[PDB]
Amino acid sequence: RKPPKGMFLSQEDVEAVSANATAATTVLRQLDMELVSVKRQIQNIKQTNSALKEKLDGGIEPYRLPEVIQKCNARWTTEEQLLAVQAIRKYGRDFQAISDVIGNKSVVQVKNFFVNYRRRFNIDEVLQEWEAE
Amino acid sequence: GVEGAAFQSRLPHDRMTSQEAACFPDIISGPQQTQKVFLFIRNRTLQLWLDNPKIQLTFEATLQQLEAPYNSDTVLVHRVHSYLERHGLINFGIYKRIKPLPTKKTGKVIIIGSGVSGLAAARQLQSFGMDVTLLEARDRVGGRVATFRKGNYVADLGAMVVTGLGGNPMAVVSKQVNMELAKIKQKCPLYEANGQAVPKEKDEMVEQEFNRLLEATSYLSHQLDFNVLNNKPVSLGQALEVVIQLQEKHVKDEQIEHWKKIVKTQEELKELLNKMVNLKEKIKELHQQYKEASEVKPPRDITAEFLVKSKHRDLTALCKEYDELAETQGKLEEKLQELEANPPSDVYLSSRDRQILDWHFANLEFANATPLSTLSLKHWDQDDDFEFTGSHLTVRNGYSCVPVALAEGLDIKLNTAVRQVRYTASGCEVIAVNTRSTSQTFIYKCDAVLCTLPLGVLKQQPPAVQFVPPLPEWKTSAVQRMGFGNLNKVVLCFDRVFWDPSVNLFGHVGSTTASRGELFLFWNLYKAPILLALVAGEAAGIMENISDDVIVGRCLAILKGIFGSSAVPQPKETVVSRWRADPWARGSYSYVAAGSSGNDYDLMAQPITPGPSIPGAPQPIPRLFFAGEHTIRNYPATVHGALLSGLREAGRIADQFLGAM
Ligand SMILES: Cc1cc2c(cc1C)N1C=C[C@@H](c3ccccc3)[C@]13C(=O)NC(=O)N=C3N2C[C@H](O)[C@H](O)[C@H](O)COP(=O)(O)OP(=O)(O)OC[C@H]1O[C@@H](n2cnc3c(N)ncnc32)[C@H](O)[C@@H]1O
Ligand SMILES: O=C(OCC1CCNCC1)N1CCC(F)(CN[C@@H]2C[C@H]2c2ccccc2)CC1
Ligand SMILES: [Cl-]
Ligand SMILES: [Cl-]
């Protein structure tokens, strides 16, 4: 038939437990030892880990900045135009950032601008700057 | 119907046997129609015998109750009835005869031993009208069917069990004798060293494992072919150890790969606590830098306005990242307490279980009368396809009742130890002696010897019995190869019943493996207050040296712990078996030793044919025949087996010395 359920007996395993007089209690202690090793390796990486949890005690709560909820306008103020260029200068094409930076332009408007002005703000020349980084 | 008598005579109702093909070759070689006629006639004649086996079934009586077109061919009905009669399928055991015994006898047979094998053959031969004389060394019949008797005390030191009546010859014998059969109540509570019962919980979940460990060996044997190990044949015991070890090995192997699957996790948590610390770092910086840059009170030029807004974004970015990494820190830290909460099995078997498993093994060593270290892994259970159906029973009034019944009216010389068996072209002489004055010598001349000497005796070195000429290598090699085991009994008689009287049997669990057999199991199944303690396993061997008293000691001790020191009297009288030391047994019964097979049981039954007296003379008749539990492949080491082995040789001897039927 097939080995009663749960009972385990590989071809290979039987060779191993017979092929000398006490290959029996070699293979058994081998594991008894190679076990307590892995248990001691856990103790390290559990204590190594409870230090790094000490070092995070605080979360980031003192360091978080209120959420400014802003009215995604279509007025390009000269103030906003400059913010934009400087963001392009430092973000490349991450239009998501460049929106978050200005704080009143949807990624649409940022991509709009990105071509409408484009030659007026030498945006090619500016983006080739974000290359040298 | 009739079909049931075929099953009860151990025959297939729908097919002709090899035995039948040999005797009815015309029928079996020819038309399918006549086969079915034959088979009905056989099945019916059996049914007839069986439905009342206390009176001889004549050829006449058979033809009477037969139908047409079956009572058509009366030569065929005759041939069939005579075949069944010869081969001991009808008119066997203790029937009232109709036609009294042949006036004048034909042929002389000496039967060695009045065991059940012996007595069964004797009755057959005598009823076929031969001069039969049994030579028994003991002062009694029965051999390994012994009973103890004294007042109403009654306890088998020998066989005690009938293996259930579905195809059991003893079915018929029991109808022919005052044989009080009582089914065995299968409840058997265990009781560890101290005395405490075994919680039902456990008892089940070990026996479960025991059964599983066996199936395991059968797998290891058949599927993986694990049957030789560096030239020696593989023991069942060896296989059992190998399986158990591989079960300890897995238990560990699993633990290993669980704790291993923790570090994979606990060391992913580390690779993250790092990113999360080198971000509390990067975020510290960024906040300062934003604070410092928001210092610059407005109005400010657009570079300093950008630097503020730039940093603000940059820092809410890294505050996102750290929230998605303490997302992760949450899940991983649960996944860890999951693995911490359900760890695979600690051990394979508690040393308290390994002890209860040892009793389930002791029970197997009792059944087989040998250390499991000796049983053939491949063949230990070759008889298994032939077990009768029905619950096992016990003889309430002593099994002895059966041998004695059979012995009535036979020429039995008791206290006659056979010393030499000589067989030649021309006949045989058996030289025996009186057991009491050894020097008083007897000589029996006969056409045939039937040897029911026990395998133990056949094995004695140096020989108890000398064969002249000597048994051929093929026979002697079989005798060395087969196992003859051992198994003693302690008969404890008491003034009154201090045990559960609805309980047939209850185990004791030995401290260590090495003593698993030692009074491991107690039987109350006699009418008077009597307990039977088995010694099985390596123990049976050693207990024979230790003295009657010590044994009855270890024995009472064990009972006190289980029934309280108050209620355990000194025993009225005690007996201890010592079967290995009994020289008319040299042990208890046969086993399939590693490096044996069933085929050896067959060699043991093969009769010996002497060489010719004058060179260049015709091939003689065989002279030396063998029966007993060691000779019957399909029903070894039992009474029914012996019983059958006897019936068999009688037919083979009749066929030779009286011409076939
Ligand atoms: C010893 C013993 C046997 C158990 C037995 C317990 C014990 C303690 N039982 C234990 C469990 C049981 C069992 C159940 C199912 C399967 C296996 C086992 C049981 C039992 O409970 N149920 C069962 O059916 N068989 C049992 N058996 C097996 C049967 O008893 C035997 O196979 C059966 O009785 C054999 O009868 P037989 O083959 O004729 O051998 P035996 O020794 O009786 O007769 C030979 C004669 O030779 C005589 N003899 C010797 N040497 C000489 C000489 N040198 N010159 C002259 N004469 C000589 C000898 O004294 C004896 O009278
Ligand atoms: O009911 C019984 O009580 C024992 C009980 C078993 C259940 N639990 C509580 C104890 N018995 C005992 C003898 C038996 F186990 C069968 N014996 C072996 C198959 C024979 C065999 C094989 C190979 C070579 C020789 C002989 C059946 C009847
Ligand atoms: Cl033949
Ligand atoms: Cl041996």
XYZ file of C-alpha atoms in Angstrom, chain B:
661
model
C -25.961 -23.488 2.436
C -23.630 -26.306 1.217
C -21.219 -23.393 0.441
C -20.813 -22.961 4.267
C -19.598 -26.565 4.794
C -16.875 -25.925 2.103
C -15.744 -22.804 4.042
C -16.009 -24.787 7.355
C -13.828 -27.560 5.789
C -11.353 -24.752 4.710
C -12.252 -25.324 0.960
C -13.432 -23.047 -1.867
C -17.117 -24.033 -2.646
C -16.779 -22.973 -6.365
C -13.312 -24.416 -7.321
C -11.484 -27.784 -7.176
C -8.312 -27.817 -4.940
C -4.821 -29.126 -6.033
C -5.493 -32.178 -3.720
C -8.726 -32.835 -5.721
C -7.016 -32.371 -9.141
C -4.534 -35.096 -8.090
C -7.307 -37.579 -7.195
C -9.960 -36.598 -9.849
C -7.845 -35.653 -12.872
C -10.527 -37.011 -15.269
C -13.048 -34.464 -13.798
C -10.914 -31.340 -13.398
C -9.284 -31.850 -16.913
C -12.659 -32.312 -18.613
C -16.101 -30.711 -18.905
C -17.115 -27.677 -16.706
C -20.529 -29.406 -16.141
C -19.058 -32.482 -14.283
C -16.772 -30.152 -12.170
C -19.918 -28.478 -10.681
C -21.463 -31.961 -10.052
C -18.272 -33.072 -8.251
C -18.166 -29.803 -6.232
C -21.859 -30.125 -5.138
C -21.347 -33.818 -4.125
C -18.249 -32.856 -2.097
C -19.893 -29.760 -0.510
C -23.055 -31.798 0.308
C -21.186 -34.798 1.848
C -19.226 -32.299 4.015
C -22.467 -30.518 5.043
C -23.859 -33.962 5.914
C -20.816 -34.942 8.089
C -20.750 -31.480 9.669
C -24.498 -31.177 10.564
C -23.842 -34.191 12.882
C -20.230 -35.296 13.433
C -20.947 -37.606 16.447
C -21.803 -40.564 14.084
C -19.843 -42.016 11.122
C -21.157 -40.906 7.668
C -21.255 -44.178 5.609
C -21.212 -44.189 1.741
C -24.858 -45.429 1.990
C -26.147 -42.567 4.229
C -24.499 -40.103 1.753
C -26.187 -41.621 -1.345
C -29.530 -41.696 0.628
C -29.613 -37.869 1.144
C -28.195 -36.962 -2.331
C -30.488 -35.396 -5.042
C -30.747 -36.443 -8.726
C -28.972 -36.000 -11.084
C -26.250 -36.258 -8.326
C -27.156 -39.766 -6.978
C -27.014 -40.696 -10.713
C -23.260 -41.593 -10.918
C -22.657 -43.749 -7.789
C -18.983 -44.535 -8.629
C -18.399 -40.707 -8.532
C -20.305 -40.280 -5.195
C -18.231 -43.277 -3.838
C -14.804 -41.911 -5.054
C -15.709 -38.500 -3.459
C -16.880 -39.971 -0.079
C -13.750 -42.192 0.101
C -11.455 -39.169 -0.764
C -13.076 -37.018 1.949
C -12.786 -39.931 4.444
C -9.052 -40.628 3.712
C -7.955 -36.981 3.914
C -9.807 -36.596 7.280
C -12.573 -34.184 6.137
C -15.430 -36.462 7.353
C -15.291 -39.266 10.011
C -12.399 -37.633 11.998
C -12.031 -37.204 15.760
C -14.513 -39.099 17.994
C -17.543 -40.453 16.100
C -19.701 -43.458 17.019
C -18.755 -46.042 14.307
C -21.562 -47.815 12.356
C -19.538 -50.769 10.839
C -17.165 -51.914 13.668
C -13.344 -51.843 13.136
C -11.747 -54.233 10.587
C -11.598 -57.625 12.422
C -8.014 -58.194 11.042
C -5.545 -55.226 10.742
C -3.178 -54.388 7.787
C 0.325 -52.814 8.260
C 2.031 -51.812 11.575
C 2.745 -48.068 12.281
C 4.721 -46.700 15.253
C 3.660 -43.110 16.114
C 6.278 -41.208 18.232
C 4.446 -38.909 20.727
C 0.731 -38.809 21.791
C 0.451 -35.031 21.140
C -2.700 -33.904 19.308
C -0.822 -34.505 15.942
C -0.059 -38.076 17.186
C -3.510 -38.966 18.575
C -5.292 -37.516 15.510
C -3.191 -39.648 13.085
C -3.525 -42.757 15.387
C -7.403 -42.629 15.295
C -7.405 -42.162 11.460
C -4.973 -45.062 10.854
C -6.745 -47.388 13.357
C -10.125 -46.543 11.732
C -8.547 -47.407 8.309
C -7.641 -50.740 10.068
C -3.870 -50.536 10.657
C -2.060 -51.719 13.832
C -1.200 -48.393 15.467
C 0.941 -48.001 18.587
C 1.886 -44.623 20.060
C 5.133 -44.296 22.072
C 4.903 -41.358 24.563
C 7.854 -40.390 26.865
C 5.452 -38.620 29.319
C 3.192 -40.313 31.957
C 0.275 -38.580 30.073
C -1.288 -37.787 26.699
C -1.498 -34.259 25.205
C 2.100 -33.046 25.252
C 1.935 -29.240 24.868
C -1.807 -29.458 25.701
C -1.358 -29.774 29.442
C -3.968 -28.930 32.080
C -3.423 -28.532 35.871
C -6.056 -30.272 38.103
C -6.578 -30.408 41.914
C -10.036 -30.252 43.576
C -11.912 -27.735 41.305
C -8.659 -25.845 40.487
C -8.176 -26.260 36.688
C -5.653 -24.279 34.571
C -3.935 -25.013 31.183
C -0.108 -24.718 31.523
C -0.293 -25.465 27.776
C -2.641 -24.243 25.042
C -5.758 -22.418 26.493
C -7.156 -20.678 23.309
C -9.344 -21.840 20.387
C -8.888 -19.301 17.507
C -12.582 -19.143 16.613
C -14.673 -21.656 14.836
C -15.012 -20.406 11.213
C -13.088 -23.129 9.405
C -11.693 -24.546 12.672
C -11.512 -28.340 12.876
C -11.818 -27.800 16.638
C -15.411 -26.638 15.840
C -16.165 -30.348 15.116
C -13.971 -31.689 17.973
C -15.840 -29.384 20.454
C -19.250 -30.855 19.334
C -17.736 -34.402 19.953
C -16.403 -33.547 23.526
C -17.622 -32.033 26.903
C -15.638 -28.922 25.866
C -16.897 -25.790 27.748
C -15.943 -22.970 25.267
C -16.133 -19.356 26.612
C -15.482 -16.316 24.338
C -12.665 -13.957 25.530
C -13.966 -10.516 26.671
C -11.600 -8.197 24.692
C -11.359 -5.392 27.428
C -7.723 -5.443 28.797
C -6.821 -2.551 31.162
C -3.052 -1.774 31.647
C -1.327 -0.787 34.974
C 2.176 0.843 35.041
C 4.904 -0.238 37.533
C 3.593 1.848 40.575
C 0.026 0.399 40.171
C -1.895 3.305 38.565
C -4.234 2.207 35.682
C -3.405 3.764 32.264
C -5.745 6.681 31.413
C -8.072 5.545 28.524
C -6.791 8.705 26.666
C -3.231 7.188 26.283
C -3.976 3.404 26.041
C -5.783 4.136 22.711
C -3.132 6.563 21.322
C -0.236 4.072 21.893
C -2.131 0.993 20.534
C -2.955 3.329 17.596
C 0.833 3.916 17.220
C 1.745 0.181 17.722
C -0.610 -0.874 14.855
C 0.859 1.996 12.738
C 4.458 0.923 13.568
C 3.689 -2.642 12.370
C 2.003 -1.457 9.073
C 5.222 0.646 8.840
C 7.426 -2.546 8.870
C 5.168 -4.187 6.283
C 5.741 -1.036 4.108
C 9.487 -1.107 4.908
C 9.565 -4.840 3.880
C 7.277 -5.057 0.754
C 7.623 -1.543 -0.875
C 11.235 -0.558 -0.004
C 12.499 -4.231 0.046
C 14.374 -3.830 3.411
C 14.892 -7.605 3.937
C 18.735 -8.126 4.004
C 21.107 -5.857 6.041
C 24.861 -6.505 5.307
C 24.322 -10.266 4.611
C 22.076 -11.111 7.671
C 18.286 -11.355 7.075
C 16.227 -8.500 8.654
C 14.351 -9.148 11.943
C 10.885 -7.594 12.596
C 12.390 -6.066 15.789
C 15.216 -4.525 13.614
C 12.626 -2.993 11.203
C 10.508 -1.762 14.211
C 13.622 0.043 15.654
C 14.491 1.508 12.189
C 10.850 2.760 11.828
C 10.785 4.220 15.402
C 14.195 5.928 14.881
C 13.005 7.503 11.571
C 9.940 8.728 13.621
C 12.260 10.374 16.267
C 14.328 11.731 13.290
C 11.256 13.398 11.685
C 9.975 14.910 15.053
C 13.408 16.743 15.194
C 13.743 17.469 11.386
C 10.352 19.392 11.864
C 11.401 21.391 14.973
C 14.607 22.321 13.057
C 12.636 23.593 9.979
C 10.130 25.511 12.304
C 12.718 27.456 14.416
C 14.496 27.872 10.967
C 11.273 29.526 9.597
C 11.306 31.849 12.680
C 14.883 33.202 11.982
C 13.936 33.755 8.272
C 11.166 35.979 9.898
C 13.009 37.364 13.027
C 15.944 38.296 10.626
C 13.514 40.022 8.145
C 12.301 42.113 11.154
C 16.031 43.025 11.701
C 16.515 44.066 7.969
C 13.517 46.433 8.636
C 14.217 47.758 12.171
C 17.432 48.906 10.334
C 15.686 50.814 7.445
C 13.329 52.209 10.173
C 16.282 53.442 12.389
C 18.201 54.952 9.368
C 14.964 56.972 8.793
C 14.230 58.184 12.343
C 17.862 59.308 11.586
C 17.224 60.903 8.117
C 13.920 62.461 9.517
C 15.717 63.980 12.598
C 18.092 65.910 10.175
C 15.240 66.959 7.764
C 13.016 68.396 10.602
C 15.912 70.494 12.096
C 16.706 71.648 8.482
C 12.994 72.650 8.003
C 12.809 74.280 11.494
C 16.086 76.248 10.632
C 14.707 77.207 7.179
C 11.305 78.327 8.678
C 13.462 80.471 11.101
C 13.933 82.927 8.160
C 10.859 85.149 8.989
C 9.145 86.388 5.797
C 8.981 88.256 3.560
C 11.706 86.074 1.966
C 13.069 85.667 -1.572
C 11.636 82.686 -3.461
C 14.839 80.505 -2.969
C 14.303 80.588 0.884
C 10.505 80.029 0.365
C 11.273 77.033 -1.917
C 13.830 75.694 0.586
C 11.081 75.668 3.275
C 8.388 74.109 0.996
C 10.959 71.719 -0.630
C 12.054 70.363 2.850
C 8.330 70.156 3.957
C 7.460 67.781 1.061
C 10.783 65.826 1.403
C 9.956 65.228 5.123
C 6.223 64.205 4.623
C 7.652 61.752 1.966
C 9.999 60.062 4.527
C 7.125 60.138 7.112
C 5.033 58.129 4.568
C 7.920 55.540 4.078
C 8.310 55.063 7.922
C 4.500 54.590 8.330
C 4.576 51.833 5.580
C 7.571 50.172 7.360
C 5.788 50.154 10.799
C 2.882 48.717 8.726
C 5.264 45.770 8.081
C 6.800 45.788 11.672
C 3.176 45.075 12.871
C 2.452 41.985 10.629
C 5.942 40.387 11.033
C 5.628 40.786 14.865
C 2.260 38.854 14.833
C 3.495 36.165 12.357
C 6.277 35.604 15.058
C 3.854 35.083 18.073
C 1.880 32.684 15.735
C 5.039 30.503 15.247
C 5.843 30.988 19.015
C 2.296 29.679 19.886
C 1.991 26.365 17.841
C 5.413 24.587 17.817
C 5.488 21.044 16.270
C 5.627 17.978 18.621
C 8.283 18.163 21.437
C 9.130 14.349 21.503
C 8.114 11.215 19.464
C 7.174 9.094 22.580
C 7.256 9.955 26.341
C 9.538 7.370 28.113
C 6.209 6.487 29.943
C 4.644 5.648 26.469
C 7.786 3.803 25.109
C 7.042 1.578 28.229
C 3.312 1.036 27.282
C 4.374 0.461 23.613
C 6.786 -2.167 25.118
C 3.762 -4.064 26.557
C 2.029 -3.973 23.090
C 5.323 -5.586 21.816
C 5.499 -8.058 24.759
C 1.949 -9.087 23.675
C 3.304 -9.756 20.101
C 6.291 -11.726 21.632
C 3.720 -13.837 23.520
C 1.676 -14.572 20.392
C 4.865 -15.561 18.526
C 6.684 -17.122 21.564
C 9.958 -15.317 20.649
C 11.829 -12.049 20.873
C 10.732 -9.890 17.868
C 14.574 -9.809 17.239
C 14.209 -13.401 15.865
C 10.988 -13.150 13.693
C 11.489 -12.968 9.901
C 10.469 -9.455 8.871
C 9.462 -10.841 5.445
C 7.548 -13.976 6.655
C 6.591 -13.696 10.374
C 2.847 -13.490 9.402
C 2.596 -15.803 6.284
C -0.224 -17.791 8.084
C -2.201 -14.490 8.226
C -4.410 -15.092 5.127
C -5.786 -18.330 6.745
C -6.987 -17.201 10.201
C -10.455 -18.504 11.116
C -13.376 -16.057 11.551
C -14.981 -15.824 15.052
C -13.959 -14.491 18.452
C -11.191 -16.496 20.217
C -12.410 -18.711 23.125
C -10.917 -20.621 26.073
C -11.527 -24.137 27.375
C -13.274 -23.539 30.711
C -12.768 -27.205 31.845
C -9.110 -27.808 30.731
C -7.950 -28.385 27.098
C -6.628 -31.818 28.370
C -10.254 -33.054 27.927
C -9.538 -33.195 24.082
C -6.302 -35.291 23.952
C -7.794 -37.656 26.543
C -11.020 -38.065 24.510
C -8.907 -38.818 21.356
C -6.614 -41.273 23.241
C -9.587 -43.485 24.255
C -9.177 -46.911 22.591
C -5.608 -46.464 21.216
C -2.485 -48.532 22.103
C -0.452 -45.914 23.990
C 2.822 -46.872 25.698
C 3.477 -44.048 28.293
C 6.967 -43.656 29.912
C 8.510 -44.884 26.600
C 11.205 -42.449 25.462
C 12.218 -43.158 21.854
C 16.037 -43.082 21.641
C 16.736 -44.348 18.023
C 14.598 -44.557 14.820
C 15.973 -46.976 12.125
C 14.344 -47.066 8.651
C 15.441 -49.193 5.672
C 14.189 -50.584 2.357
C 12.530 -53.526 4.262
C 10.964 -51.639 7.215
C 11.745 -49.780 10.469
C 12.688 -50.490 14.052
C 12.140 -47.894 16.858
C 14.392 -48.462 19.935
C 12.733 -46.862 23.066
C 13.391 -47.136 26.882
C 11.372 -46.837 30.130
C 11.685 -43.277 31.521
C 11.863 -44.562 35.145
C 14.492 -47.379 34.796
C 16.404 -46.064 31.672
C 18.205 -49.496 31.247
C 14.889 -51.412 30.495
C 15.000 -51.377 26.609
C 12.115 -51.811 24.050
C 12.177 -52.639 20.289
C 9.189 -51.902 17.997
C 9.227 -53.343 14.419
C 6.889 -51.509 11.937
C 6.207 -50.787 8.169
C 6.171 -46.996 8.925
C 7.208 -44.471 11.631
C 5.184 -41.233 12.091
C 7.399 -38.725 13.990
C 5.410 -36.121 16.005
C 8.624 -35.178 17.913
C 8.509 -31.427 18.632
C 10.820 -29.141 16.678
C 12.668 -28.366 19.956
C 13.504 -32.093 20.347
C 14.519 -32.403 16.641
C 16.865 -29.510 17.384
C 18.532 -30.887 20.674
C 22.396 -30.811 20.424
C 23.466 -33.396 21.123
C 20.501 -35.357 19.669
C 17.823 -36.835 22.077
C 16.830 -39.152 19.163
C 19.232 -40.756 16.649
C 18.058 -41.378 13.078
C 19.537 -44.461 11.310
C 20.322 -43.670 8.788
C 20.688 -39.932 9.545
C 18.108 -37.437 8.229
C 19.318 -35.900 4.954
C 20.886 -32.383 4.830
C 17.655 -30.967 3.270
C 15.627 -31.983 6.364
C 18.270 -31.095 9.018
C 18.903 -27.612 7.489
C 15.119 -26.929 7.687
C 15.181 -27.978 11.381
C 18.125 -25.599 12.194
C 16.507 -22.731 10.190
C 13.035 -22.780 11.778
C 12.571 -21.024 15.053
C 11.321 -22.821 18.090
C 10.217 -20.302 20.688
C 9.216 -20.347 24.406
C 6.494 -18.883 26.662
C 5.849 -19.897 30.352
C 2.687 -19.583 32.576
C 2.271 -18.932 36.367
C -0.886 -20.598 37.773
C -1.985 -18.663 40.921
C -4.801 -20.389 42.951
C -6.503 -18.321 45.715
C -9.146 -18.756 48.518
C -11.456 -16.061 46.913
C -11.873 -13.671 43.927
C -9.983 -10.345 44.616
C -10.069 -9.019 40.949
C -12.673 -7.642 38.501
C -14.798 -10.750 37.625
C -16.206 -9.198 34.382
C -12.504 -8.770 33.251
C -10.957 -11.822 31.429
C -7.459 -10.310 31.299
C -5.428 -7.270 32.446
C -1.821 -6.243 31.622
C 1.030 -5.073 33.894
C 3.590 -2.686 32.278
C 7.275 -3.399 33.036
C 9.678 -0.554 33.918
C 12.261 -1.404 31.185
C 12.179 -2.971 27.639
C 14.487 -5.862 28.746
C 11.664 -7.096 31.080
C 8.548 -6.246 28.976
C 7.604 -9.977 28.923
C 7.885 -10.601 32.685
C 4.369 -11.325 34.102
C 3.139 -8.739 31.548
C -0.467 -10.158 31.411
C -2.931 -11.962 33.760
C -5.908 -14.261 32.901
C -9.049 -15.028 34.921
C -11.191 -17.350 32.797
C -11.487 -20.469 35.073
C -14.502 -21.062 37.453
C -12.483 -21.271 40.761
C -10.303 -18.260 41.845
C -7.234 -18.665 39.552
C -4.954 -16.095 37.883
C -2.598 -16.955 34.972
C 0.541 -14.821 34.508
C 2.310 -15.078 31.125
C 6.102 -14.754 30.837
C 6.912 -13.950 27.133
C 9.869 -12.408 25.242
C 13.551 -12.590 26.245
C 12.037 -12.888 29.771
C 10.578 -16.418 29.304
C 14.107 -17.736 28.701
C 15.578 -16.103 31.868
C 12.596 -16.675 34.264
C 13.152 -20.477 33.858
C 16.401 -20.159 35.975
C 14.816 -17.943 38.738
C 13.120 -20.104 41.449
C 9.370 -20.937 41.850
C 9.126 -18.692 44.979
C 10.906 -15.552 43.632
C 8.550 -15.807 40.562
C 5.408 -16.101 42.758
C 6.982 -13.124 44.628
C 7.481 -10.732 41.634
C 3.923 -12.004 40.877
C 2.120 -11.052 44.127
C 4.067 -7.732 44.363
C 2.655 -6.842 40.853
C -0.956 -7.754 41.944
C -0.769 -5.821 45.321
C 0.168 -2.492 43.567
C -2.967 -2.964 41.331
C -5.504 -4.369 43.905
C -4.090 -2.937 47.179
C -1.938 -4.863 49.733
C -5.175 -5.658 51.759
C -7.017 -7.882 49.205
C -4.072 -10.101 47.808
C -3.941 -13.427 49.849
C -0.984 -15.877 49.951
C -1.794 -18.289 47.078
C -3.502 -21.631 48.063
C -1.142 -23.397 45.479
C 1.035 -22.269 42.548
C 2.514 -23.769 39.312
C 5.228 -22.444 36.949
C 5.739 -23.776 33.362
C 9.400 -24.375 32.275
C 8.839 -25.402 28.626
C 12.366 -24.686 27.328
C 13.719 -26.966 30.099
C 11.047 -29.704 29.583
C 12.991 -32.220 27.447
C 9.760 -33.502 25.652
C 9.218 -29.982 24.271
C 12.564 -28.062 24.455
C 10.244 -24.949 24.117
C 6.585 -23.889 23.396
C 6.014 -23.657 19.585
C 7.399 -22.779 16.151
C 8.117 -19.300 14.733
C 9.305 -18.114 11.329
C 12.887 -17.216 12.337
C 14.629 -14.634 10.137
C 16.256 -16.576 7.254
C 13.423 -19.207 7.335
C 10.181 -19.098 5.261
C 6.923 -21.092 5.094
C 8.760 -23.344 2.621
C 10.657 -24.863 5.622
C 7.300 -25.904 7.232
C 6.865 -27.935 3.951
C 10.314 -29.623 4.020
C 9.509 -30.595 7.698
C 6.427 -32.575 6.393
C 8.205 -34.290 3.453
C 8.666 -37.974 4.388
C 12.079 -39.720 4.108
C 12.607 -42.673 1.741
C 15.437 -45.062 2.716
C 18.094 -46.137 0.149
C 17.626 -49.620 -1.409
C 18.741 -52.713 0.669
C 20.615 -54.493 -2.255
C 22.290 -52.098 -4.786
C 20.401 -52.050 -8.165
C 16.972 -52.854 -6.609
C 13.783 -50.794 -7.184
C 13.158 -47.448 -5.370
C 11.507 -48.238 -1.982
C 8.303 -46.844 -0.495
C 9.013 -44.076 1.990
C 9.041 -45.276 5.633
C 9.588 -42.175 7.907
C 6.669 -39.607 8.017
C 6.298 -36.341 10.064
C 3.363 -34.406 11.659
C 3.033 -31.780 14.479
C 2.624 -27.937 14.556
C 6.074 -27.523 12.837
C 4.873 -29.447 9.682
C 1.797 -27.442 8.600
C 2.717 -24.183 6.737
C -0.795 -22.746 6.833
C -1.671 -23.377 10.541
C 1.658 -23.509 12.397
C 2.160 -23.393 16.128
C -1.502 -24.173 17.001
C -3.586 -27.195 18.118
C -5.900 -27.227 15.030
C -2.586 -27.169 13.072
C -1.262 -30.311 14.789
C -4.766 -31.945 14.594
C -4.631 -31.301 10.815
C -0.916 -32.313 10.399
C -1.985 -35.703 11.910
C -5.077 -36.234 9.735
C -2.786 -35.405 6.734
C 0.027 -37.949 7.386
C -2.526 -40.732 8.218
C -4.038 -40.239 4.730
C -0.491 -40.177 3.205
C 0.470 -43.404 5.155
C -2.848 -45.155 4.248
C -2.384 -44.137 0.563
C 1.120 -45.777 0.695
C 0.469 -48.969 2.774
C -3.226 -49.571 1.787
C -3.320 -48.186 -1.848
C -5.114 -44.915 -2.779
C -8.846 -43.775 -2.631
